[PDB]
Amino acid sequence: LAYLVFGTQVDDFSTFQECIFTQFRIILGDINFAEIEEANRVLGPIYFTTFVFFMFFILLNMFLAIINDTYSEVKSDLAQQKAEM
């Protein structure tokens, strides 16, 4: 979506590889947002806000949920089936 919207204007989304790397850097906090808003006043900020919200509050928490559940189950089965004799 970013490649199709900002492809001809921004120089950070000029190629697909650059789009991927720019998104990875956005996750780590390397935002520009000046030319992003200049290029397209609507659907440019929308992309940024939705991406930040979903990648910061929802999507990256599921890895931690998986790890937490696995750790709890491992600890429970290791401490309950053992350490009883």
């Binding site: 780590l28 906090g29 990256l60 931690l64 790890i67 937490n68 750790y71 709890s72 600890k75």
Partner: peptide, 16 residues
């Protein structure tokens, strides 16, 4: 500071 998401692994432990 940059990779502060890894340090959330402590939340896996402390919580339990």
């Amino acid at each position: 500071l940059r990779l502060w998401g890894a340090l959330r692994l402590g939340a896996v432990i402390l919580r339990w």
